[PDB]
Symmetry: C3
Subunit: 390 residues, 3 copies
């Protein structure tokens, strides 16, 4: 029958308002404030955490402050292991109330909530990002959120820790937690290698032209949303590739210029005319490598016929020292994909190349180059096939 949830005679239940808060959170779970490690109160038998608030699939969880230590987690028996400190909801457990709402003594022992140590495969099997308490097809009773990588040493030592920033809603994303910017950078200058195909380094290090003969690897300001993407973990691909952590339709914006752009000089033989040289800037996706996503999670397989390369800018050099370009596109990306940008031209400098024979500032380079990658849509349901192939 047709059942009302929010109607005059309805009873508003706990799952109901949890389902409402989950909707209000754009189906994202995470720590809203605090819940960071407290090293001062951390020993070889206990791990301490500061007070804070978290939302796990619409259920509000709080670590209360008093007097510190705000909370203590038992580390006894954990040694010579890398574990995940997890916040877990277990709906098979029973919450035990005590006292009364009449007196001012009502209290609850929330046995449905746990702070625990799990190994990577156990967490993955009950990770909120892949499974749900509210799931249509496979509804779960136990769900977890990883907070920290905890590396325990020998018995009697305090452990090493690494925050799982993808599970903390810190800032930059308040208001649109499941969307917004994935990656962005400030303007940078990058030397064009004398090759037909090359990636543009989008991860914070560019080969900056410094003199008339030399270029040097120089850092530039870059930012990544750890919930949406991360720098490739393999050092071969780390300067150029992003790993996508979340499926969706993304917008890619690029702008910059090609400086010291090559062309065929106007001479009497070519009727005093500029011979333009073809170049293109492409964005690309690649899913050949599995397990690139956080925790080595299984990649989300793209639909059949999915794109791999897309031209953003395709034109000829125009005989000027510097020529500007700009491009904006929406593209489908999948969890576990590599995402990168490529510059493409011919290799014959006297005939078809957009680059010259010079080096450093005297050689062809990208100048004032920048990009923004933003999640703008999801790939749930029908969209996966209708919108996911391009």
């Amino acid at each position: 029958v047709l059942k009302g949830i929010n109607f005059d005679r309805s009873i508003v239940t706990p799952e109901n308002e949890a389902s409402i808060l989950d909707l209000a959170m754009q189906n994202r779970s995470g720590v809203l404030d605090g819940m960071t490690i407290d090293i001062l109160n951390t020993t070889s038998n206990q791990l301490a955490l500061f007070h804070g608030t978290a939302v796990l699939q619409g259920y509000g969880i709080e670590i209360t402050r008093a007097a510190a230590p705000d909370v203590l987690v038992d580390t006894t028996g954990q040694s010579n292991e890398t574990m995940l400190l997890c916040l877990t909801i277990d709906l098979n457990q029973v919450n035990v109330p005590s006292g009364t709402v009449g007196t001012n003594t009502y209290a609850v022992d929330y046995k449905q909530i746990r702070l625990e140590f799990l190994d990577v495969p156990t967490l993955l099997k009950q990770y909120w990002r892949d499974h749900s308490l509210h799931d249509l097809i496979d509804p779960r009773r136990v769900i977890s959120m990883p907070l920290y990588w905890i590396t325990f040493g020998q018995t009697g030592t305090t452990p090493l820790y690494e925050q799982i920033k993808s599970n903390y809603i810190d800032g930059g994303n308040s208001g649109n937690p499941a969307y917004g910017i994935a990656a962005r950078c400030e303007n940078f200058n990058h030397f064009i290698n004398k090759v037909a195909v090359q990636s543009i380094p989008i991860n914070g290090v560019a080969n900056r032209p410094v003199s008339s003969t030399a270029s040097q690897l120089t850092n530039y300001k870059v930012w990544r949303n750890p919930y949406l993407c991360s720098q490739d973990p393999r050092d071969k691909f780390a300067p150029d590739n992003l790993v996508i952590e979340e499926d969706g339709i993304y917008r890619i914006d690029i702008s910059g210029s090609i400086n010291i752009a090559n062309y065929t000089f106007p001479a009497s033989g070519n009727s005093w005319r500029v011979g333009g040289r073809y170049f293109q800037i492409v964005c690309a996706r690649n899913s050949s490598a599995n397990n690139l996503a956080e925790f080595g999670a299984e990649q989300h397989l793209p639909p059949s016929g999915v794109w791999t390369r897309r031209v953003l800018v395709g034109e000829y050099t125009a005989g000027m020292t510097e020529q500007a370009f700009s491009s904006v596109a929406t593209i489908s990306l999948f969890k576990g994909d590599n995402f990168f940008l490529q510059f493409e031209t011919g290799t014959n400098t006297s005939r078809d190349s957009a680059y010259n024979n010079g080096y450093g500032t005297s050689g062809t380079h990208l100048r004032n180059f920048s990009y923004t990658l933003e999640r703008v849509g999801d790939l749930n349901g029908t969209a996966y096939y209708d919108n996911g192939t391009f």
Copy 2:
């Protein structure tokens, strides 16, 4: 007096949390999951629907699963008619509870909820998109959401069905249901007709250059959000025009290049110089035709002085074989409007035309052309006049 809704001594009512869920839904109503037709359990006297969840102006509605058939709708008396299967809320009705919260027997017969067949004019008069239970000026007691076009044949036959996808929150839009992408496409190539003004086909079919003498109508990947826009229903305008289904401020992104671009050849008579040829790419809106919106609904009239054409790219050809362009603009669009893109140039190929005299690959064409149309703002209240004219 100043009344509190969420305060210590307040009583949180059903309309209250419905108003909260409606806000959390960005004032969009629709089926969240399931509620699709069940043909196997559909006869000539009954129409079956699968289990699912829907939100109608903040009221949660559920069709429960058990044993199938999840729900049955009476089709007796319906013959030789095209009807709308609607989910309706009727606040004039009384919900009948039974049993008790003490025993485990509390149940409700939600007579305020109906699955029914309505004709187009009846649905339009109580459609959630145009009228509201929460409305300030004209508050309603009965509101409906159309789910399927149901075409009943002769007495004794099973009917034909067409899903009303604008009223299903399937995917691509979870998290920002009233906004996001309206339309997007992959890169395509389109031959420029030897005319002064022409539309660029944005609906999935382009006139692709295939040989040195010929171009052929070729499909390209395109996607449309049915809640925001649809392909024009008139075949004359179907390859080029979108119909806007929702008012708002939209962002239009375009990029591509003009290939085999025409110019005046450098000769001794013009001092060995390139004679550039003017062209422009414009976006346009037109509201002369009423009833283009879904169900033939009345168009929303734009404010006085509203724009009709906007230049996105305006420049000269530069003497190169291929020249890239890009443009991004925010524009106001109204429910019932036609939206389209136009390429504009001169008609004299030896003097002012951006196009040449060739055909197919030998003729001037758009190459790597793509666009994204996105809803980025609404036109409610004051914005209608301050932001709605451009």
Copy 3:
């Protein structure tokens, strides 16, 4: 201990659903409908306001309609002063219920809610935009939202009023209240002054080329979201500068063309070649002046190393009459900052200038110029340092 908020044995409190509604409002407070001044029922002793709804840090406030006047505020004792009419929540007060839920006589005198007159410094000390009832570090018990600037004259006169539009969620922003468009304009034409550095007027008045010898100051359609930005209050900077009212990551889109663009004419001395002229379009931020934000509020100080200028377009003129450009960038902006756009070129018209020696339509100018400024991300927590410098 781990406390549940939305769990089976939990008690859902007023602060809880207020915290839920605040999240659903993207942490924005404001009037949702009505609450505008009622001049007809306004005397020299009372100020009247129409019925309406407002949300203040998740608490729903309503002014009820009956018979008018919907509400009356005591103006006795207020004379020869500019005051702020404020809606205030005071959690130190006690809400007084009466009657019973059994009979149909339950009512509450919400003493925690006040409509009052405050001076600018008092409002600033308890303004919702800077302080919170839900705040982690400095939780407050009293918070206010300014609705109108009320200027009282001599005793016996009705006052003058100015609506505080930043605190009214009117339209354009329903669904994404804390984000969306900050500023946008229609295409305009603007004469390039014969200087090295100049601002592009983004506030609705351009110096439009009208004849072969003259340009004239002409209005163009522009829109600003008062919650996000305002026109600079100092007349020296009013045609060009915006004041940012809210911190965040913003997207800036620009497009247009440079018409009657200057270049070195091809002659026998330069081997019949076009000598390109360098120009750049930059966006800029400046925080040297404090108190530019609404109510003269203290500016939010940017992180150390913050950007001040960013190149959007950097290239040479290409020998054509008109050359198009486009650019999209994400930038950090802070409350109290000035934001503006600059056109930059050389000053020698016979050597390095992108502009010529002509005036009006015969002189170099921006044609079909437009922009969109949009808030796309916040700068809360860690983002302030990681994302706030660029």
